[PDB]
Amino acid sequence: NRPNRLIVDEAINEDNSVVSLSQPKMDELQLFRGDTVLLKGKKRREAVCIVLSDDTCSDEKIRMNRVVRNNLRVRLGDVISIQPCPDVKYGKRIHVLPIDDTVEGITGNLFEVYLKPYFLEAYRPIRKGDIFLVRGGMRAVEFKVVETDPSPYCIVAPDTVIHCEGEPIKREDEEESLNEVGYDDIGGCRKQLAQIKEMVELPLRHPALFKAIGVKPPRGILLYGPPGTGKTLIARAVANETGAFFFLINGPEIMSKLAGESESNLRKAFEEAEKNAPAIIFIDELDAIAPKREKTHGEVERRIVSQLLTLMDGLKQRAHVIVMAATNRPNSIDPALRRFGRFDREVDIGIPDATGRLEILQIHTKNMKLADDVDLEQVANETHGHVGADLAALCSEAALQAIRKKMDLIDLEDETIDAEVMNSLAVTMDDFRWALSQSNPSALRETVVEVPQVTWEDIGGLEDVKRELQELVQYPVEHPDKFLKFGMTPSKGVLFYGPPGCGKTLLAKAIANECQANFISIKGPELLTMWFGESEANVREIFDKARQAAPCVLFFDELDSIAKARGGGAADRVINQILTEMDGMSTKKNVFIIGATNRPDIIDPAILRPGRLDQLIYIPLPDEKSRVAILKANLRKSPVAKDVDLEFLAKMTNGFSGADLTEICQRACKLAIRESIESEIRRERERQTDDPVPEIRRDHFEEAMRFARRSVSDDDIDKYEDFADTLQQSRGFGS
Amino acid sequence: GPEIMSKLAGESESNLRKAFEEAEKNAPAIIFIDELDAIAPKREKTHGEVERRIVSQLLTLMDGLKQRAHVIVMAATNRPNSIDPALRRFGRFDREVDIGIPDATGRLEILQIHTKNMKLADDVDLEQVANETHGHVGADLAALCSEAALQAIRKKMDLIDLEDETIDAEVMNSLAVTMDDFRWALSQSNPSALRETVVEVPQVTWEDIGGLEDVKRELQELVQYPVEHPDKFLKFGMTPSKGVLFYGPPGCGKTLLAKAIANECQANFISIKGPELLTMWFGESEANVREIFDKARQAAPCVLFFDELDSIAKARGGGAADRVINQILTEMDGMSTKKNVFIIGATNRPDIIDPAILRPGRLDQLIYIPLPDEKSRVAILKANLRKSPVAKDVDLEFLAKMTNGFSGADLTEICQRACKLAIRESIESEIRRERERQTDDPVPEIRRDHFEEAMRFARRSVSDDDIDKYEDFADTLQQSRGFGS
Numbered sequence A: 001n002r003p004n005r006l007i008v009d010e011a012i013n014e015d016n017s018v019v020s021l022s023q024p025k026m027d028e029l030q031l032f033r034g035d036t037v038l039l040k041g042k043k044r045r046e047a048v049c050i051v052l053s054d055d056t057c058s059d060e061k062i063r064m065n066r067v068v069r070n071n072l073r074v075r076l077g078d079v080i081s082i083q084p085c086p087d088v089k090y091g092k093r094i095h096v097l098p099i100d101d102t103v104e105g106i107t108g109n110l111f112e113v114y115l116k117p118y119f120l121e122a123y124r125p126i127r128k129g130d131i132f133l134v135r136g137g138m139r140a141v142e143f144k145v146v147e148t149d150p151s152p153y154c155i156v157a158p159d160t161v162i163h164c165e166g167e168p169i170k171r172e173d174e175e176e177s178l179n180e181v182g183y184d185d186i187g188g189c190r191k192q193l194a195q196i197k198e199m200v201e202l203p204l205r206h207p208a209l210f211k212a213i214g215v216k217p218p219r220g221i222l223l224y225g226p227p228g229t230g231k232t233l234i235a236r237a238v239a240n241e242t243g244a245f246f247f248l249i250n251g252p253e254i255m256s257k258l259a260g261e262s263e264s265n266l267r268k269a270f271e272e273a274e275k276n277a278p279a280i281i282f283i284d285e286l287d288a289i290a291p292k293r294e295k296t297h298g299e300v301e302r303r304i305v306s307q308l309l310t311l312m313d314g315l316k317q318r319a320h321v322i323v324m325a326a327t328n329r330p331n332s333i334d335p336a337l338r339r340f341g342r343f344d345r346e347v348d349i350g351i352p353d354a355t356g357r358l359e360i361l362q363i364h365t366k367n368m369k370l371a372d373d374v375d376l377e378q379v380a381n382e383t384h385g386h387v388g389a390d391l392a393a394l395c396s397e398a399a400l401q402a403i404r405k406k407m408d409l410i411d412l413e414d415e416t417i418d419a420e421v422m423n424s425l426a427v428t429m430d431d432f433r434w435a436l437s438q439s440n441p442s443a444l445r446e447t448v449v450e451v452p453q454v455t456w457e458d459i460g461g462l463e464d465v466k467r468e469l470q471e472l473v474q475y476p477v478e479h480p481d482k483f484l485k486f487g488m489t490p491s492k493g494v495l496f497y498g499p500p501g502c503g504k505t506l507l508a509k510a511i512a513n514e515c516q517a518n519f520i521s522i523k524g525p526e527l528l529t530m531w532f533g534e535s536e537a538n539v540r541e542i543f544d545k546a547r548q549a550a551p552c553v554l555f556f557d558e559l560d561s562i563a564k565a566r567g568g569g570a571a572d573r574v575i576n577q578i579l580t581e582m583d584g585m586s587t588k589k590n591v592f593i594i595g596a597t598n599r600p601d602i603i604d605p606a607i608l609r610p611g612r613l614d615q616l617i618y619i620p621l622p623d624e625k626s627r628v629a630i631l632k633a634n635l636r637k638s639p640v641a642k643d644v645d646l647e648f649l650a651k652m653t654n655g656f657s658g659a660d661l662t663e664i665c666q667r668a669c670k671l672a673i674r675e676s677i678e679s680e681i682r683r684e685r686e687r688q689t690d691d692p693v694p695e696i697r698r699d700h701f702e703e704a705m706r707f708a709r710r711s712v713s714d715d716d717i718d719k720y721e722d723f724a725d726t727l728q729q730s731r732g733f734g735s
Numbered sequence B: 001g002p003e004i005m006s007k008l009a010g011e012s013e014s015n016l017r018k019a020f021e022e023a024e025k026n027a028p029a030i031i032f033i034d035e036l037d038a039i040a041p042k043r044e045k046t047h048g049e050v051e052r053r054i055v056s057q058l059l060t061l062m063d064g065l066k067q068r069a070h071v072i073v074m075a076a077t078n079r080p081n082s083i084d085p086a087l088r089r090f091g092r093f094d095r096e097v098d099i100g101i102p103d104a105t106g107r108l109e110i111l112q113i114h115t116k117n118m119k120l121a122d123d124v125d126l127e128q129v130a131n132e133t134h135g136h137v138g139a140d141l142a143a144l145c146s147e148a149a150l151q152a153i154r155k156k157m158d159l160i161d162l163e164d165e166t167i168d169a170e171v172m173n174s175l176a177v178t179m180d181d182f183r184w185a186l187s188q189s190n191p192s193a194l195r196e197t198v199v200e201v202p203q204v205t206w207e208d209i210g211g212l213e214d215v216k217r218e219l220q221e222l223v224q225y226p227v228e229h230p231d232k233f234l235k236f237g238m239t240p241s242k243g244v245l246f247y248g249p250p251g252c253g254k255t256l257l258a259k260a261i262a263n264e265c266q267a268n269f270i271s272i273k274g275p276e277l278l279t280m281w282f283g284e285s286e287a288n289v290r291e292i293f294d295k296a297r298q299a300a301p302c303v304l305f306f307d308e309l310d311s312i313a314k315a316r317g318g319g320a321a322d323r324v325i326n327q328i329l330t331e332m333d334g335m336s337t338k339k340n341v342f343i344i345g346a347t348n349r350p351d352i353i354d355p356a357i358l359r360p361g362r363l364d365q366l367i368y369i370p371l372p373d374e375k376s377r378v379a380i381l382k383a384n385l386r387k388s389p390v391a392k393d394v395d396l397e398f399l400a401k402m403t404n405g406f407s408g409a410d411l412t413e414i415c416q417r418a419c420k421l422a423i424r425e426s427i428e429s430e431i432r433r434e435r436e437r438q439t440d441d442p443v444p445e446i447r448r449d450h451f452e453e454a455m456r457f458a459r460r461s462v463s464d465d466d467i468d469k470y471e472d473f474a475d476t477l478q479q480s481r482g483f484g485s
């Protein structure tokens, strides 16, 4: 039917009165950016909005904020009709009232703090019956438009009168709160959130459709990841955005009950959910109820486990119910639960990446007034090893710091703290740097999986090797069809070998960056850390996380460290298992394995077998051209004098490794800083009785050159040159 | 199981009691105990008095079938070893059925069952999918089909835009499942049983292996004849040797040969690489090794292949590798000649293989597999490039002459490497047309120029020193049981 009908989608402009279409659709229904559009949703409600163009928006979809989304009584995936509305006229009076539960903690002049800057210069199209949201004074309050003089909808011009008559109204039964959790409250893990969204939309959102079809949906989705990553958060969001009934099972609470009551509460939970289908039963801290079969020693505890198992099987009802569960330790869960027909789907909600943490930070600073000096992206880059909860907490603590120092002044009369005072409250970048020092990040020891920021431009020379890496890794990803036509499947892995400090580690990260694929680094020593017993299970989890992160490059660095320890029964079991995991790794899975070693003489020939690390790429010391590129790359970030001759520098340093060059750069720079520090003191002495000299000069290099030493001896090189010729012969007898 | 064990103490014993009474009542009957290990695990694992009672309770009812009212008791479990052996006694659960993981052909069958009701697109080729979904189990396939179906629905949400909870076979029947919808569900697949040892007939034939013709026939002597012609061996009064040992330089087709001979006899095949065996814990290893020989018995006639034995020999000087090999030695002797179970070993290092393996009755058939002659090298190069679109210009006899000393694997390297230039060229040619367009003619063929670069960059895997020793060992391998030097 008609073109005006459109599908609801996530928002990009967090602004309430803004909806977005594609320019091809904005042309189709003949609307432009300024236009005010009228939206008709379900439950016979209307909302009016400013339309805009959005390059990301698919033409059959309409991006609307969750505020708009609620006013229509609509959710993601539903259909709404959009139509131009030039008939909108400026208001005389608008009468908005707050909702009690969103203000009962806060006092002051609601009209002057929130409505004022919200409508000022905003020209917001509003509608009678709409509920809009204003964030400020570290609080978010929602007002409902009770009346407009040009009803039902009017624009809010500066001329318009806006009144609030004191006492707030209660929430209507149908009016979902915006204080509630949503997808816009979760960041940095889109990919996982997508999979969860996929599995659950079809059965929950369209229940009759799935009962009629007779094909099986997922019923048990298991969320796992480190603590505080937002597992409990996600479950609530999915339930609210789909509008499904949400029944919470808090692990500890169930297991805190008597024997009989525990099994009972489980039964009641499932029964009530089947009753109010569609629903999500969420089991938080599952390992509390159902740990490994051995550790469950204590018989009543085993009864509860089986009880749960019967209830999960009890989804024979298939009343449109999904059971979600969260756990810190996937390994702790009774494997009986991860059986088919129960918790069959697993989502790794990992630690957030750099961009992710930034996103998180933005969500928990929404309501706070931040000073201009605050650069959350900087905070984001510094907060490595931080998890969602760490960030949410540090944001809270940075706020409480800003509160305390600003309450030193208010303390002269602590009785009257107002919202007006709260909006005046600014949060300095210092308040954040403060919270950083006070932060106790949990996930520093967690294995990180993200796309590296080392690019080709950080690596000097080896240009043709970069291209061979593009052949081996990038082409089979971006051009699978092409490999199919030639009838060849690509090699699984590569082995870097060469003298120390030539860029083997950089290359592994480099090719990853080019392919925009995830990266996993595993150093030799890291593998010898695992207890004798633990090692077997930990290796398997590594290859599993590589699958999760496909397309992914798995890099085993510093293999020399392991090779030493074997010729040692511990290190041996590890590698044999790594070998086994490679073979189990299907080539089709888009998981690429790279090895690196400074010791090609002792590497296990079994690794070099066809199908494993069969691509033997030798990485030698840099020649004269490369040495220039290396020195340039490292010193990009450094303020260098035009005096410095690097090509002359290159010839002098023949025999030096890539690392040996960064050695000279750092050594020369430390003199430059040494000079900068001793000069500030001299300037200090001169004032006691403005033109600093921050730039590195020729003698600094000439001094560093004077003390520079070589990491790779000549005898070592001559052997390395030989191994470049005979490495592939090691599968026979020892060369 | 879980339902029983979720109930009160008394109710559990009662329900077990009630269950048997009902079966004898309405005989003939089947009592099905699903997830048996839930009720009766190994007695040590069952600390807690009532849990042991239920086991004993169950055991008595099983003894209680002395009634012989025509009642059969069936039971299912994930972990056979977890069951209290007291149940596996005669007069109780006396018959056991190994429902293994499906093989290639099996998976194909399964897929067909779960595509029964779906309108499958014309492009869909399940046999490819069957071959692609290795390590998948019946339920994995059941899900994959289910997920591929929901993908086809997922793609057709323009139709769902109706959003009305309305059924309409008209649109529903039009709904097809493309091969892409399978490939999507394939990438999203969570295969469980990849770690399981697979038992099937290999798809590698003689024709996939170039040369080594006389070795193929000796495998027919050793394997096929005692299978296809037991009577001849019987009248002549000799029973044949149990197993074979392949030894030679790396990449000559030892892994392929084992699978090839399996294919010819249409007999089951079990591959176990060295590293795979060293992964098992000291303790765990002992039961899994027995498990291998048992599944070999299950699948008789079967060829049991232990690959990359060099990896194990290396590791013993290791308390694991010592027990592993020593236990395998014991299992071979326990292998009765009558069982039609043939054991083949492979190693790239005959210098370090344990002499005990070479004793009569074990791997006493010492087959040396050397570098491929010119004849073989041509056949190999064709074999590898069958599946690829090659130019008529390409001279394989020329490549064969260039590659004297090269192993069979060294030839596939050249074939694959020549292809690597061709693909980058194919991509780099399309980019060139795209930049010219910005201001049906591509070349779907691998060419001599690609081969000429790959030949120039080609490498030899086997050194002369390596070859000369392999040649010496070919005559003196059987002497390693005495004093070795």
Ligand SMILES: Nc1ncnc2c1ncn2[C@@H]1O[C@H](COP(=O)(O)OP(=O)(O)OP(O)(O)=S)[C@@H](O)[C@H]1O
Residues within 6 Å of the ligand: A185, A186, A187, A188, A189, A226, A227, A228, A229, A230, A231, A232, A233, A234, A284, A285, A326, A327, A328, A360, A363, A387, A388, A389, A390, A392
């Ligand atoms: N990805 C995220 N985006 C936004 N906020 C997050 C995110 N992850 C965690 N948080 C915050 O962390 C806090 C705790 O979230 P929870 O869901 O309870 O953590 P969790 O994953 O359930 O960890 P538990 O309690 O050990 S299972 C919430 O207040 C969130 O705001």
Ligand SMILES: Nc1ncnc2c1ncn2[C@@H]1O[C@H](COP(=O)(O)OP(=O)(O)OP(O)(O)=S)[C@@H](O)[C@H]1O
Residues within 6 Å of the ligand: A458, A459, A460, A461, A499, A500, A501, A502, A503, A504, A505, A506, A507, A596, A598, A629, A630, A633, A634, A657, A658, A659, A660, A662
């Ligand atoms: N090609 C290069 N370009 C720029 N810097 C390099 C290059 N090669 C080595 N380096 C420097 O040496 C450091 C470490 O190099 P790696 O990537 O780790 O090489 P490697 O072969 O793994 O040697 P090691 O033993 O790990 S240092 C880097 O941090 C660089 O500063």
Ligand SMILES: Nc1ncnc2c1ncn2[C@@H]1O[C@H](COP(=O)(O)OP(=O)(O)OP(O)(O)=S)[C@@H](O)[C@H]1O
Residues within 6 Å of the ligand: A609, A610, A731, B208, B209, B210, B211, B212, B249, B250, B251, B252, B253, B254, B255, B256, B257, B346, B348, B372, B380, B383, B384, B407, B408, B409, B410, B412
């Ligand atoms: N006679 C041959 N015919 C066809 N391909 C061969 C032949 N010999 C070696 N190859 C190739 O080399 C690869 C590996 O050979 P294998 O069957 O594994 O023998 P191998 O003795 O076990 O050598 P390795 O150490 O396992 S590579 C195969 O995938 C083939 O592509």
Ligand SMILES: [Mg+2]
Residues within 6 Å of the ligand: A232, A284
């Ligand atoms: Mg929680």
Ligand SMILES: [Mg+2]
Residues within 6 Å of the ligand: A505, A557
């Ligand atoms: Mg390094």
Ligand SMILES: [Mg+2]
Residues within 6 Å of the ligand: B255, B307, B308
């Ligand atoms: Mg092999």
